């Protein structure tokens with residue numbers, strides 16, 4: 690596999706969004722992965738509606754601001770036959786009744802692929818597919834205050850993920866401890882958090898924070 694990957698440089702990644710005070714991380718993770726696979730197919734990068742997922746994918750198992758799963762979001766897009774653009778169905782950070790309008794649908798998918806629960810398989814997926822939806826343990830103050838560098842949290846769990854984000858690449862940089870490898874992760878807490886909204890999460894450190902345990906992407 691390549692030693693460094695960054696899908697932002699290939700145009701697969703929209704700007705950082707902000708989920709506000711709603712537990713809708715899963716919706717931003719899913720739109721991020723579908724944005725990348727739609728661009729892979731069509732060469733047009735179109736921001737997708739998280740509100741559409743939050744309001745409408747309950748029948749697939751999602752619970753709006755009370756949490757969800759990216760895979761359920763991908764199943765909703767396939768079941769529904771579409772997903773509206775962000776511009777047409779703007780984000781409101783609260784669950785409302787479903788207002789999907791097929792006329793403004795700009796994305797589709799045909800299923801999704803779950804990645805084996807190893808960082809080696811995640812790396813191969815990131816290298817060959819595009820941005821990947823993943824779930825992490827983001828429940829530590831260290832993660833709130835992250836500013837730069839490779840994020841490593843000794844108390845991070847690889848089994849209890851609470852946060853859906855998007856791996857857009859990986860790479861390396863020299864460090865004091867010589868744990869040099871990172872996943873390049875897009876968060877949904879706005880551009881003020883972290884490095885312009887991104888975090889470098891420790892890679893190849895025993896599936897740190899569970900980043901490889903629930904990874905998937907939509908098939909377009």
Ligand SMILES: *[C@@H](C(=O)N[C@H](C(=O)N1CCC[C@H]1C(=O)OC)[C@@H](C)CC)[C@H](O)C(=O)NCCC
Nearest residue numbers: 709710711712713714715756757827851852853
């Ligand atoms: C994922 C989720 O939304 N996470 C949630 C979160 O990001 N916020 C809660 C309110 C505003 C943000 C925040 O922390 O801003 C600083 C918390 C619980 C993360 C620490 C959602 O709970 C979910 O569906 N998780 C399951 C895995 C996809």
